[PDB]
Structure formats: C-alpha cells, structure tokens
Amino acid sequence: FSRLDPPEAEVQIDRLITGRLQSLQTYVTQQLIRAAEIRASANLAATKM
Amino acid sequence: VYADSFVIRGDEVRQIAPGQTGNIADYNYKLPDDFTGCVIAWNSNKLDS
C-alpha cells in the first residue's frame, strides 16, 4: 500500500488477494476430498461394528 | 458536472493527478483517490505571465 501510487496499488493487491483466495480454495478442495475418503472409511467401521 | 480552475507552475502539473505527494497535492489542492473525470493543461506563458 505504501510505496506504489493509488492507480496500480489495486493492480497489485488484487493480485495478492486472488492468490490467497486461490490458496484457500485449494486447501478447501483438498479437505472436501479427504473428508469424502474418511466418510467412505467411516461407514466401513459402522458396518463392521 | 463541475469545473475547478487554477494556474500552476509546469513542474507541478504532475502532482495534480490522483494520489501524489508534494506541496501542491497535499497543502493546496488534493484530488480524491477515487477520481472520475478529466484534467486539462495548456501552456499560457503569454496570457498569464
């Protein structure tokens, strides 16, 4: 925010923000796939029990 | 529509644009960061000097 002037300050902090949103999106997608795998494994324990 | 009008020295015409530092753009006339309009500048050496 400090050095770059206002017209392209955004042309940079949107880059940062969408990059971090992409990182969060990747983490969330990985967690949804892993949770599906666990739920597949969790239902093989309810049946075994 | 509105119309601000004034006269400045040449070297300072760069400070008018949105978000700049210096004497003119911080002590005399400051444009909002989120400007929406135009700016005009024509040499007036004979008329105004």
Curated annotation (Swiss-Prot), chain B:
Residues 9-11 are annotated as: Integrin-binding motif. It comes from the Viruses. Attaches the virion to the cell membrane by interacting with host receptor, initiating the infection. The major receptor is host ACE2. When S2/S2' has been cleaved, binding to the receptor triggers direct fusion at the cell membrane. When S2/S2' has not been cleaved, binding to the receptor results in internalization of the virus by endocytosis using host TFRC and GRM2 and leading to fusion of the virion membrane with the host endosomal membrane. Alternatively, may use NRP1/NRP2 and integrin as entry receptors. Binds to host ACE2. RBD also interacts with the N-linked glycan on 'Asn-90' of ACE2. Cleavage of S generates a polybasic C-terminal sequence on S1 that binds to host Neuropilin-1 (NRP1) and Neuropilin-2 (NRP2) receptors. Interacts with host integrin alpha-5/beta-1 (ITGA5:ITGB1) and with ACE2 in complex with integrin alpha-5/beta-1 (ITGA5:ITGB1). May interact via cytoplasmic c-terminus with M protein. May interact (via N-terminus) with host bilirubin and biliverdin, thereby preventing antibody binding to the SARS-CoV-2 spike NTD via an allosteric mechanism. This is Spike protein S1. The lineage of its organism: Viruses, Riboviria, Orthornavirae, Pisuviricota, Pisoniviricetes. The chain holds residues 395 to 443 of 1273 of the full protein.
